[PDB]
Design a protein around this nucleic acid. Structure first.
Ligand code: MG
Ligand code: MG
Length: 739
RNA sequence: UUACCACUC
C-alpha cells in the first residue's frame, strides 16, 4: 500500500470487539415428518435447547452454536396437536472463525437485543431515546437523540460502528395542523391538507411505529367500523385512549393502512423552516456536533453499556467484549499540488481554497466576447447597468475582452415575452455568443423556459442572474468575477489545471439522477476527456427508458468519446480511467461482474485496440467519521487525509479519502473501491490521481468531495432530468454548457 | 438561478 504523506494520528467512531471464543459451529437440521411453521421448529429446538445448550442462533434451517456437539445427534420430540413423535437430527456442516463473514447477521441481532435492554426505542433502523427529547418551544419541535449502530467486519477485525443521529418530531398533532389550515383557509383546505400530507412521514406515539401516509380519507369517521368492530372500542380496549372528538378524517397509507389524525404526529424538518435562516441557524447550532461532542457521546454510550450488567452479559454469552474506547488508527496526509494558470502557478495553500488567485490572474484559454445580448426587465435598468460596468473593470486582470452588450428591455415580465424576444434576437442576429437574462424574484418556470429554449430548441449558451444578487452594492465585484468565469467556461474556455502524471490518459465519470418520485425516467450522465491536459470534455446523457438496458447506450457514448479523442489527438488512449458514482452498496457485484466486461467489448470496433483500464466505484453516503488527535482534544482533520487499512473492505482494494475542508463537525471521507485494475496501478498512484481530480472542478475555486468528472456528470444529469426533460442538443456537447 | 460542505390496520 501507499507510504507517501505525513503520518497523521487519527481517531475513529469504531469500537473494536474482542472475541474470546475459538470457533463457531454451523449445523443443519432436518424434520421428519415435515414441519412448515418456523415457530414450531423453534419450539422443538427449544425442547432440544437442553443437550444443544442455551446459546442458540437459529434461523429455520441453519443453527449456530458456540459449543462443539457431536458429528451427528438424533433427538425425539413430541408434536403439540397430533400427539405424534417427530425426529430432529442435527449434523455438523462447518467450523467458522468468530470474525467470519457469515456471523454478522445474528451478531447484529444480539446487539439489537443489547441496545433494546438499555431502555431505547426503535424508530426505523436507529435507536432513539424519547425521554431525553429537547423541545424547541419557540418552533414547536422536538429533537430526539439517538444512535445508528451496527456491527461490521473489516480487514482489521470485528468492529461496532456507532454514529449520533437526531430525529425531528412535531409537538402538535396533525389534527391541530388540519384545524389550523381549516382556520386560515375555508374552501381550498382539502387540497392544501393533501399537499402537506403526501410527502411527509408520520408516526404513532402509543406504539412508536412509522407509516408514510400518501392519501387522506374524507368520508369515513371513527364512528364507522372496520375489519367487524369499531375504531373507538378497539382503541379504548387495546390502549384505553379516550378520544375527545370523533368527527376527524382518516389517513391512508399504501405499501390498507388506516390511521387516526389525533393519534398521528408528523416527522421531518418543517417545510417553512428551511426557507428561514435564523431558524436553521439555531437548528444547525444544536444538531451538528463538534468532534469533541461526538466522541463524548460515544464514550457515554460505551459507559452506559458497561455500567449495565445485563447488557454486557448478553454480549459475553458469545464471548464478545466491547472495548472501553474508540479505535485509534494512523492515516497519511497526501502531498499538495500545483495549480497552474496561463503564466503563473501557485502551491495550493493549507486551506485548499484559492478564490482570490483565480480572480487576480489570467486563465489558460479565453474566448473573446464581441456579440452577446442582455435581456433585462423594466425595473432593473440601474443595477443591470452597474453590473455591466463592473464586468468591464474586472475583465482586464482575468484577460477577457468583452464589448458592450446588446441591451434589450423587456416590456413586461411575462414568460412568453422573454421567449419571443430571445427567439427574435436569435433569428435576426446569428452571431450572438451568449444570452444573459435578468429575472425578478424567484421564478422557476421562467428558468425552465429559458434553459429549454437555449439548450434544446435553439442551441446558444445562456446565463441567468437574479436581481437580488447584483442589487447589493457591497458584493458586486466578487460576484461579477465569478459570473464572468462561469461565462468563460460556458463559451469553451479553460480556467486552471493540475499536472496529470500518467501519459495518454482518458478520464470518464458517471453519475445517476433519480427523480424524487423515483419511478420516472432515471438519467445517467457521461463525461469524458478529449484532451491530453484534461481540459476539454465531451459529455452525453442517456435515459433509463423501459424495455432496453442502459449499458448498450453507454457503449455508444464510450465509442463516440473515443472517436472524438482520436480527432483531437490523432491517437487512442492507452489508459482509460472510469469513475462510476451513484451505484448503491447492493450492486457492486452487479457492476463489476456484468457492466464493466460489457463495456470492455466495445473496444473491438477499433481493430487491434486493447486499452489498460482502471475502474472505481465512488460512495458518498458513508457513516464513518475521522478525528485528528491534537494534544488537547479532538479537532477536524486536515484536508487530504487518506486511509487504506484497518477499516477497508476485505474483498476489494479500496481507500477512504478526505479532500475537502470541513468548516464544522467531524469529517466524512469518500470511499473508493477498485473493481478492475488491468493497468496494474499502485495504490498510492490511485489515491493521488483521485486527489488531483478533486481539484479540477471549475465552478468552485477549491477542492471538492468527488472527482471533477463525477460532479460534472451529476450536474448534467440533474439539468437534463429536472429542467430540460430532454437530451441536450449535440452542438452544445463540445463545451461545458451545463454549468 | 453566482457558487459550494449543505403482526400494522
Ligand atoms: Mg450522485
Ligand atoms: Mg450555473
Amino acid at each position: 500500500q501507499g507510504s507517501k504523506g505525513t503520518p497523521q494520528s487519527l481517531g475513529l467512531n469504531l469500537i473494536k470487539i474482542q472475541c474470546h471464543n475459538e470457533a463457531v459451529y454451523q449445523y443443519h437440521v432436518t424434520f421428519s415428518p415435515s414441519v412448515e411453521c418456523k415457530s414450531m421448529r423453534f419450539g422443538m429446538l427449544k425442547d432440544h435447547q437442553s443437550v444443544t445448550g442455551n446459546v442458540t442462533a437459529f434461523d429455520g434451517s441453519i443453527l449456530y452454536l458456540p459449543v462443539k456437539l457431536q458429528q451427528v445427534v438424533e433427538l425425539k420430540s413430541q408434536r403439540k396437536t397430533d400427539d405424534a413423535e417427530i425426529s430432529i437430527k442435527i449434523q455438523l456442516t462447518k467450523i467458522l472463525e468468530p470474525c467470519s463473514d457469515l456471523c454478522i447477521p445474528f451478531y447484529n441481532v444480539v446487539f439489537r437485543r443489547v441496545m433494546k435492554l438499555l431502555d431505547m426505542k426503535l424508530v426505523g433502523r436507529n435507536f432513539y431515546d424519547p425521554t431525553s427529547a429537547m423541545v424547541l418551544q419557540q418552533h414547536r419541535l422536538q429533537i430526539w437523540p439517538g444512535y445508528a449502530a451496527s456491527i461490521r467486519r473489516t480487514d482489521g477485525g470485528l468492529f461496532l460502528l456507532a454514529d449520533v443521529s437526531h430525529k425531528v418530531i412535531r409537538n402538535d398533532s396533525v389534527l391541530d395542523v388540519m384545524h389550523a389550515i381549516y382556520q386560515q383557509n375555508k374552501e381550498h383546505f382539502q387540497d392544501e391538507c393533501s399537499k402537506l400530507l403526501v410527502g411527509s412521514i408520520v408516526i404513532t406515539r402509543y406504539n412508536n411505529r412509522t407509516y408514510r401516509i400518501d392519501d387522506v380519507d374524507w368520508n369515513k369517521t371513527p364512528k364507522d367500523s372496520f375489519v367487524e368492530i369499531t375504531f373507538l372500542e378497539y382503541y379504548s380496549k387495546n390502549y384505553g385512549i379516550t378520544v375527545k372528538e370523533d368527527d376527524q378524517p382518516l389517513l391512508i397509507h399504501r405499501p390498507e393502512i388506516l390511521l387516526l389524525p389525533e393519534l398521528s404526529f408528523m416527522t421531518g424538518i418543517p417545510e417553512k423552516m428551511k426557507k428561514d435562516f435564523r431558524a436553521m441557524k439555531d437548528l444547525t447550532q444544536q444538531i451538528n456536533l463538534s468532534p469533541k461532542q461526538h466522541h463524548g457521546a460515544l464514550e457515554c454510550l460505551l459507559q452506559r453499556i458497561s455500567q449495565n450488567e445485563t447488557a454486557s452479559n448478553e454480549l459475553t454469552r458469545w464471548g464478545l467484549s466491547l472495548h472501553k474506547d474508540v479505535h485509534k488508527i494512523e492515516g497519511r496526509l497526501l502531498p499538495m499540488e500545483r495549480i497552474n494558470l496561463r503564466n503563473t502557478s501557485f502551491v495550493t495553500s493549507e486551506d485548499l481554497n484559492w478564490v482570490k488567485e483565480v480572480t487576480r490572474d489570467a486563465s489558460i484559454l479565453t474566448i473573446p466576447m464581441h456579440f452577446w445580448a442582455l435581456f433585462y426587465p423594466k425595473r432593473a435598468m440601474d443595477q443591470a447597468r452597474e453590473l455591466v460596468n463592473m464586468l468591464e473593470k474586472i475583465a482586464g486582470p482575468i484577460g477577457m475582452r468583452i464589448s458592450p452588450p446588446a441591451w434589450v428591455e423587456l416590456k413586461d415580465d411575462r414568460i412568453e415575452t422573454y421567449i419571443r424576444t430571445i427567439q427574435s434576437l436569435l433569428g435576426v442576429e446569428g452571431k450572438i455568443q451568449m444570452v444573459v437574462c435578468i429575472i425578478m424574484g424567484t421564478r422557476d418556470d421562467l428558468y425552465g423556459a429559458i434553459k429549454k429554449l437555449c439548450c434544446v430548441q435553439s442551441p446558444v449558451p445562456s446565463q441567468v442572474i437574479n436581481v437580488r444578487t447584483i442589487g447589493q452594492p457591497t458584493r458586486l465585484r466578487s460576484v461579477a468575477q465569478k459570473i464572468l468565469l462561469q461565462m468563460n467556461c460556458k463559451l469553451g474556455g479553460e480556467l486552471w489545471g493540475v499536472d496529470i502524471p500518467l501519459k495518454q490518459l482518458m478520464v470518464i465519470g458517471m453519475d445517476v439522477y433519480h427523480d424524487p418520485s423515483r419511478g420516472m425516467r432515471s438519467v445517467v450522465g457521461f463525461v469524458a476527456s478529449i484532451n491530453l491536459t484534461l481540459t476539454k470534455w465531451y459529455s452525453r446523457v442517456v435515459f433509463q427508458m423501459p424495455h432496453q438496458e442502459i449499458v448498450d447506450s453507454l457503449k455508444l457514448c464510450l465509442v463516440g468519446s473515443l472517436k472524438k479523442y482520436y480527432e483531437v489527438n490523432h491517437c487512442l488512449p492507452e489508459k482509460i480511467v472510469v469513475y462510476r458514482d451513484g451505484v448503491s452498496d447492493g450492486q457492486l457485484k452487479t457492476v463489476a461482474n456484468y457492466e464493466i466486461p460489457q463495456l470492455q467489448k466495445c473496444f473491438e470496433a477499433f481493430d487491434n485496440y486493447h486499452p489498460k483500464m482502471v475502474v472505481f466505484v465512488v460512495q458518498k453516503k458513508i457513516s464513518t467519521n475521522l478525528y485528528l488527535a491534537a494534544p488537547d482534544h479532538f479537532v477536524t482533520p486536515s484536508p487530504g487525509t487518506v486511509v487504506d487499512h484497518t477499516i477497508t473492505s476485505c474483498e476489494w482494494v479500496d481507500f477512504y479519502l478526505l479532500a475537502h475542508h470541513v468548516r464544522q463537525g467531524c469529517g466524512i471521507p469518500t470511499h473508493y473501491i477498485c473493481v478492475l485494475n488491468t493497468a496494474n496501478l499502485s495504490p498510492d498512484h490511485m489515491q493521488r490521481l483521485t486527489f488531483k481530480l478533486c481539484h479540477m472542478y471549475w465552478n468552485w475555486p477549491g477542492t471538492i468531495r468527488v472527482p471533477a468528472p463525477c460532479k460534472y456528470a451529476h450536474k448534467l444529469a440533474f439539468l437534463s432530468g429536472q429542467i430540460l426533460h430532454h437530451e441536450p442538443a449535440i452542438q452544445l456537447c463540445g463545451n461545458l454548457f451545463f454549468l
